[PDB]
């Protein structure tokens with residue numbers, strides 16, 4: 001089964017439960033109360049993103065059963081996103097203890113510091129769901 | 135999720151942030167109109183989409199003569215013994231064998247699942 | 249594509265005597281329903297459901313450029329099988345096409361625009377239901393569907 | 396009081412001919428049409444076709460206010476008729492046939 | 504006549520309705536044209552069925568279909584629709600009675616005929632679309648008799664199942680005992696048989 | 699004050715009017731004379747929490763019509779008149795809608811059949827001649 | 833077909849308008865159909881039995897006639913309407 005998992009094809013679309021593009025202008029005060037519990041953990045000592053953050057946010061919730069079936073934990077997904085998009089995107093993911101697997105995404109700090117700050121998120125989310133390979 | 139229409143020309147309102155105040159405004163196009171976006175969530179899609187089929191079920195199906203009728207599942211709302219049970223038979227379910235029950239008593243369109 | 253998969257999937261219409269398809273919202277605009285609310289009133293009969301509302305967003309975005317009935321009629325005429333020498337003639341030709349060539353069974357008189365718009369919205373509604381999986385796709389081999 | 400059991404019955408009158416024809420003006424609910432701001436209005440036959448067989452154009456409060464377009468109901472009432480009951484000092488209802496039906500939609 | 508009757512009854516024309524009302528109401532289509540909407544689809548269908556079975560304002564071949572789930576009522580009158588006669592079943596009982604059978608037995612010298620059955624509303628023509636919504640009983644003596652309740656809402660009963668066969672397949676004796684391609688082969692051969 | 703001006707005095711007074719859908723037999727009975735100034739009497743009986751509307755056909759005209767009300771909240775309706783003097787005016791706003799239904803159920807279908815035959819009279823059919831033209 | 837469609841097709845056929853000044857209008861009103869007939873070489877019509885048609889290789893056909901009204905407007909303020917019965 002390990003070889004079968006390593007051979008078959010799995011896309012963020014397969015391991016993602018849902019996606020939502022929130023505004024969330026202030027990361028410290030997240031629009032999502034559930035997020036605010038653990039997002040503040042990362043934003044208490046933020047690194048590589050204190051300079052600037054794009055106002056928009058892309059929240060993706062991942063299916064626990066699919067994640068366990070493909071042996072895909074919360075780490076390598078963010079690592080793959082980082083490798084694919086360079087520093088273009090900042091990814092902050094919750095812990096497996098939480099019943100909901102959440103991965104907030106924002107655009108790079110430099111661009112914030114041309115297409116669209118909003119529609120570009122729809123572009124990346126759909127390409128991540130289909131084109132990207134986990 | 136909500137869709138807002140311009141009050142001036144009744145056109146679709148698209149989301150735009152205002153850098154001056156850093157708040158979401160549903161701004162009209164070809165109209166030069168703006169509104170304050172209270173909901174905040176502009177887009178959301180559920181891939182799993184565990185939609186409650188009871189919402190799709192229509193109480194009028196109790197009048198269908200071709201649907202099976204069982205008296206072993208009385209209606210909770212009114213206690214009526216007779217009820218009509220059927221499968222979803224709706225695509226995207228990818229597992230459709232459970233039975234949805236609808237009360238056969240007129241004026242009581244109660245629907246449930248076991 | 250970046251924007252291709254961002255907007256989603258859009259609805260077009262292959263009208264008769266028109267070489268290439270046109271966006272459905274453009275057809276509605278030509279029929280004379282300009283406001284997105286008016287068009288969506290004829291397409292979606294229950295605004296409470298957001299799932300069907302999201303389905304029509306790409307079509308509205310694609311047809312956003314055209315906002316006037318005459319503009320939509322000229323757009324259709326420019327793609328008519330017999331291009332009009334002038335814009336007024338193109339409009340006169342597109343109006344004739346939408347009056348007698350599209351949905352003739354609904355009506356061919358001059359004042360059948362509302363009926364045709366309602367029926368076209370019903371067609372779009374059926375397409376949206378099929379896409380959403382709320383209705384089973386029609387079976388070609390079914391005989392009630394044969395004469 | 397008398398309101399809980401009031402019974403009202405009125406005569407019905409149908410004059411053979413009326414100087415002013417009666418039509419129906421229908422506005423969509425979502426448009427939120429309000430007559431308080433209707434200080435002035437202009438209803439006239441359209442000029443796009445360039446008369447009795449053409450749609451109607453309404454311009455409320457001149458160019459500043461909203462513009463609506465009315466189209467005759469294509470479906471004829473070969474088996475139906477519409478009548479309007481209006482209060483009058485004599486206390487008898489008066490019925491007038493609907494010559495035409497018009498659905499007006501605002502123009503941005 | 505169908506459109507006139509629908510207008511007479513509480514069917515709101517499309518032009519004279521706000522779109523918001525379309526949600527709850529059931530659409531009314533005639534020959535593929537969306538004529539209007541109605542609020543009491545069950546009562547409308549009952550009235551239409553009664554009219555068709557009485558041959559008053561609806562002819563026999565007109566087919567009325569109520570898609571309850573889709574909230575639609577499609578009335579079809581155009582030609583080319585294939586339909587067959589079926590006995591009407593109400594309250595698990597045939598409307599065909601011994602009086603009808605006796606009048607048919609005396610078919611001649613009394614003017615009684617099949618048209619009289621159709622007018623009496625004991626047997627009505629069903630097309631494929633309406634047959635989707637019909638609850639057929641193969642035979643009255645077995646399927647709608649008081650027994651293990653497989654179904655107690657039968658709407659029609661087959662006159663005789665053998666009527667599913669064609670002219671050439673109807674001359675095969677005991678065709679239900681033959682492997683089907685042999686029935687097909689005999690259907691082919693009967694057209695080449697001498698006589 | 700101009701030719702195209704609409705007299706909104708009816709709207710200002712908020713005059714309420716009732717719209718009714720009535721059958722052709724009733725309308726034609728009214729049209730028969732149409733000049734006697736009388737066609738019937740509309741009787742409305744109200745109870746503690748229920749109101750019924752009915753119309754009685756004139757005895758002379760005949761030689762019961764219950765009324766069913768309809769909600770008008772889904773669409774706003776107004777009545778306007780085009781005077782022969784080219785002075786458009788508004789009569790009032792529709793506040794209630796009603797439908798008139800026949801009392802007879804079966805025997806009424808006989809009159810409906812007679813109407814259908816009358817309407818079919820103009821329909822022309824191919825005629826079987828006997829004796830070739832010469 | 834014979835009873836409804838032929839007559840309806842003739843009725844629905846638009847009136848023929850001609851002008852090139854006087855103008856002529858042709859309208860087809862009514863359809864008439866006689867029994868199947870066969871014309872001998874001498875020109876005498878006679879009813880054609882189906883067996884006779886089968887034996888003589890004839891076509892079992894019925895003559896078709898239309899009532900045609902021709903109205904001519906000469907621009908002289910008088911229009912002349914002449915009806916040709918069973919053309």
Ligand SMILES: [Zn+2]
Pocket residue numbers: 139140141142143144145162163165167
């Ligand atoms: Zn606007």
Ligand SMILES: [Zn+2]
Pocket residue numbers: 209210211212213214237238239242243244
């Ligand atoms: Zn119940």
